[PDB]
Amino acid sequence: ELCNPQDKQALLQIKKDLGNPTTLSSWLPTTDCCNRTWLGVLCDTDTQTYRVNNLDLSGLNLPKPYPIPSSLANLPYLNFLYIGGINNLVGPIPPAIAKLTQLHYLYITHTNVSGAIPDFLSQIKTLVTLDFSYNALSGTLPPSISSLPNLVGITFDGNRISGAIPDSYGSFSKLFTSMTISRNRLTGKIPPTFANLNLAFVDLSRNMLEGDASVLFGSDKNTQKIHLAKNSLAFDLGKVGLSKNLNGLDLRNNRIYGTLPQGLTQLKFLHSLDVSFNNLCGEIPQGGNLQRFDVSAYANNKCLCGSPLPACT
Amino acid sequence: DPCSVTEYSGLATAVSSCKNIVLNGFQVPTGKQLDLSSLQNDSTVTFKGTTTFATTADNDFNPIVISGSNITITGASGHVIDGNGQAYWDGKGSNNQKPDHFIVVQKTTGNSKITNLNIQNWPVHCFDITGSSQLTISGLILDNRAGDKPNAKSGSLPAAHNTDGFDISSSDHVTLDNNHVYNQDDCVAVTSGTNIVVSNMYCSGGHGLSIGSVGGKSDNVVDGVQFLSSQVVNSQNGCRIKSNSGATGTINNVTYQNIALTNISTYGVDVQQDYLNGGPTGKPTNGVKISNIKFIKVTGTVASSAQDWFILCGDGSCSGFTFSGNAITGGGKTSSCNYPTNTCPS
Ligand SMILES: *[C@@H]1O[C@H](CO[C@@H]2O[C@@H](C)[C@@H](O)[C@@H](O)[C@@H]2O)[C@@H](O[C@@H]2O[C@H](CO)[C@@H](O)[C@H](O)[C@H]2NC(C)=O)[C@H](O[C@@H]2O[C@@H](C)[C@@H](O)[C@@H](O)[C@@H]2O)[C@H]1NC(C)=O
Ligand SMILES: *[C@@H]1O[C@H](CO)[C@@H](O[C@@H]2O[C@H](CO)[C@@H](O[C@@H]3O[C@H](CO)[C@@H](O)[C@H](O)[C@@H]3O)[C@H](O)[C@H]2NC(C)=O)[C@H](O)[C@H]1NC(C)=O
Ligand SMILES: *[C@@H]1O[C@H](CO)[C@@H](O[C@@H]2O[C@H](CO)[C@@H](O)[C@H](O)[C@H]2NC(C)=O)[C@H](O)[C@H]1NC(C)=O
Known part of the structure; x- marks a missing residue:
């Protein structure tokens, strides 16, 4: 068989550790795990070792609760590990x-x-992305993962993570382009060290963040989406520079004040904007795509005026 | 009969009280929604006659919305659903306000089905399927051929634009079977979802059968999509997988099997990871993994303007591509692949 004997033992042991779920019926000990018959299993055809390097465990419908099997460590060539959509998968990241x-x-x-999200992840230097979204993880953000040299993104949304964002999270590499930690209980200020990041996508919405977020803006950045809704942020929006690539800005339900920056007019790809429920004042800049938006994009501010809203006096 | 709706004013009463509803073909007034979002469990809605819509020039407006559990939306012989597309089309699509989503299928669960609808002249995107599970959509004809020509507002360009047939997100176990789409953009586009099946499709005039663009959205995981036994003709692409530059996510277990191509203008097969604001950059990133992609018996003829194959993966982000029985031929521009190797199948 193409399948490596130890990989096969490890896969069957993982299946056993998950209670031999019926959804993994295709993992038959009499069959070659490298033939695409075993659901979710792929072997390395690039190096042609055919070691199992891609494992996808999704929607398994476990009959009882089980932890993540430690037998995963017996697939030492895993490059890609997806474990998702399993209500009865419980316990910590082992x-x-x-x-x-x-x-x-x-x-x-x-x-x-x-x-907690464990700090030992900082030891896996090959890591490109981490996605631990929508579980029940708690504790604070592990500061050590800022040292991961290949990491391009973290997706930690929808957990119970608390505390402040580490200052060390400004130290991700120039390869790091995506940071989402929305829907948690993060408190405090966005670190000034975030001046050292250049994020295509940032989502820190639905937390308890306070203060200035200007460090996430800049005309020099290569940024597509900025999502900070439903925090208690407060800063003068009129002073920020905007990335030429920005297509989505969602600042809804904060305490941001000042006027809207005229640079919004120069954004060719701005297709989503929501600055409603803030403390903005003045004329909405006239130009670009700003007049395409519903009045609800600008609603509930302090003293905004101008199309799409009634004209200024 | 409160369950037989002859005018818009009788719709709400029927949805609130009736498990078998008939819509007899009336015009829905401006700013008013054909609201089937409150359908009772096990309800059936049958379209009869010709349903039309007054003009509502609003990007955020959604003319038809569908939601419920174990519901059936279907059409009787001769029925037509006209989306008033001629009133909006201006050559630019989603870029003059036009309802962006014609039919929203949201939170529809429990072995629901949409069958045998005859839909023509819709404004922009047709079906937006979201947050749904165990849904079958079969036997539809989406005919936007009247938008292919220019009109009084589109200058030289086709009037209809961005007219996706079926967009799917955040859904599981959705089957699209035996549907015909004549349009000007993606026949099917899956930006997120699991266990999606797209079978026996006939796609004409649009941009093909597409995954993506994935990344940067609320859901960036696509896992288990089968495009099977389908035709793509007179389209920009045949099979397409795109991911957005700088984004993170996963596209896993996508199969294109028994796909017949005729007169494809740009790419027979297109897999690329460099999309930034609807355009290629030439610099793919590696935050979106693409793994277990199979092309099995994708055959036919593409236009001389086309490349039979185009693959532009990021560094290490692509794995497990399988090619079997493909015969994409006719392209006058040399194909270009950087994965699995530097050479294409054709
Ligand atoms: C409307 O239908 C829902 C559909 O779930 C169904 O569950 C089974 C009963 C079966 O018919 C299946 O085919 C359907 O997919 C009902 O919700 C379900 O209710 C059952 C009750 O045994 C419960 O076990 C399920 O978890 C629940 N599913 C969901 C997604 O909520 C509705 O039932 C109402 O809501 C329930 C929470 C409960 O209060 C029930 O007694 C209610 O009637 C159905 N509603 C009505 C008005 O019939
Ligand atoms: C962990 O496991 C639990 C238990 O298996 C999961 O609980 C489920 O959570 C969802 C979302 O809160 C519940 O959905 C709700 O269901 C009712 C009908 O029962 C519906 O009326 C509501 O509108 C809502 O959709 C679901 O009931 C609940 N299941 C049970 C048995 O309580 C949970 O999602 C898993 N994940 C996490 C992160 O906790
Ligand atoms: C799903 O909904 C359908 C209705 O479309 C239900 O089917 C009906 O069931 C009643 C009662 O058994 C029959 O008298 C009808 O003839 C059925 N209609 C059709 C078209 O078959 C069906 O029972 C529902 N399924 C579930 C699991 O609730």
Whole structure:
């Protein structure tokens, strides 16, 4: 068989550790795990070792609750590990994951995994992305993952993470382009060290963040989407520069004040804008795509005026 | 009969009280929604006659909305649903205000089905399927051929633009089967979802059968999509997978199997990871993983303007591509692939 004997043992042991769920019926010990018959299993055809390097465990409908099996550590060539959509997957992210020294893409999402995001992830230097969104993880953000040199994005939305964003989160590499931690309980200020990032996408909405967020703006940035709605941010919006690439700006339900920046007129691709429920004042800049928007994009501010709103006096 | 609706004013009463509803073909007034979002469990709605819509020049307006559990929306012989597209088309599509989503299928669960609808002249995107599960859409004809020509507002360009047939997001176990789409953009576009099946489609005039563009959205995971036994003709692309530059996400287990192509203008097959604001940059990034993609018996002829194949993956973001029985031929521009190897199948 193409399948490596230890990989096969590890897969069947993982299946066992998950209670032998019927959804993994295709994992038959009598069949070659490298033939595409085994649901969610792919082997390395690029190096032609055919070691299992891509594992997808999704929607398994476990009959009882099970933790993440530590037998995952016996697939040492995993490059991609997706564990998602499993209500009866429970317990913390286990240190066995730290033995996957070739892991590039890691997803543990839409489960009941709990506990803290572990700092041992900082040891997996090959990591490109981490997605731990929509579980029940708690505690604070692990500061050490800022040292990961290949990391391009983190997706931590929808958990119970608290505390402040570490100052170390300004130290991600220039490869780091995506940061989403929305729907948590983050408090405090966005660190000034974020001046050192150049994010295509940032989503810190629905937290308890306070203060200035100007450090996420800049005409020099290559930024597509800025999502900061439903915080208690407060700063003078009229002073910020805007990336030429910006297509989405969502600042709804904060305490941002000042006038809208005239640079909004020069944004060719701005297709989504919501600055409603803030403390903005003055004439809406006339030009660009600003007049395409519904009045509800600008509603509930302090003293805004101008099309699409009634004209200024 | 409160369940037989002959004018818009009788719709709400029927939706509130009736499990079997008949719409007899009336005009929905401006700013008013054909609101089937409150359908009772196990309800059936049958379209009869010709349903029309007054002009509502509003980007945010959604003319038809559907939601419920174990519901059936269907059409009887001779029925027509006209979307008033001629009143909006201006050559520019989603870029003059036009309802962006004609039919929104939201939170529809429990083995629901939409069958045998005859739809013509819709403004921009047709079906937007979202937050749904165990949904079958079969036997539809979406005919926007009247938008192919220019009109009084589009200058030289086709009047209709961005007229996606079926957009799917944040849904699981959705089957699109035996539907005909004559339009000007994606026949089907999946930006997120799991266990999606797209079978026996006939797609003409548009941009093909597409995953993406993935990344930067609220949901950026596509897992398990099958495009099977379908035709793509007179379209910009045949099979297409796109991910957005700088984004993170996952496209896994997508199969294009038994796809027949005729007169494709740009790409027989197109897989690329460099999209920034609806245009290619030439610099793919590696935050979106693309793995277990199969092209099995994608065959036919593309136009001389086309490249049979185009693959532009980021560094290490692509894995497990399988090619079997393909025969995409006719392209006059040399194909270009950087994964699995530097050479294409054709
Ligand atoms: C409307 O239908 C919902 C559909 O879920 C159904 O569940 C089974 C009963 C079965 O018919 C299946 O085919 C459907 O998909 C009902 O919700 C479900 O209710 C059952 C009650 O046993 C419950 O076990 C399910 O978890 C629940 N599903 C969901 C998604 O909520 C509705 O039932 C109402 O809501 C329930 C929460 C409960 O209060 C029930 O007694 C209510 O009638 C159906 N509503 C009505 C008005 O019939
Ligand atoms: C962890 O596991 C639990 C239990 O298996 C999951 O609980 C489920 O959570 C969802 C969302 O809160 C509940 O949905 C609700 O269902 C009712 C009908 O029962 C509906 O009327 C509501 O509108 C809503 O849709 C679901 O009931 C609930 N299941 C049970 C048995 O309580 C949970 O989602 C898993 N994940 C996490 C992160 O907790
Ligand atoms: C789903 O909805 C359908 C209605 O479209 C239900 O089917 C009806 O069930 C009643 C009662 O058994 C029959 O008298 C009708 O003839 C059925 N109609 C059709 C078209 O078959 C069906 O029972 C529902 N399913 C579930 C699981 O609730």
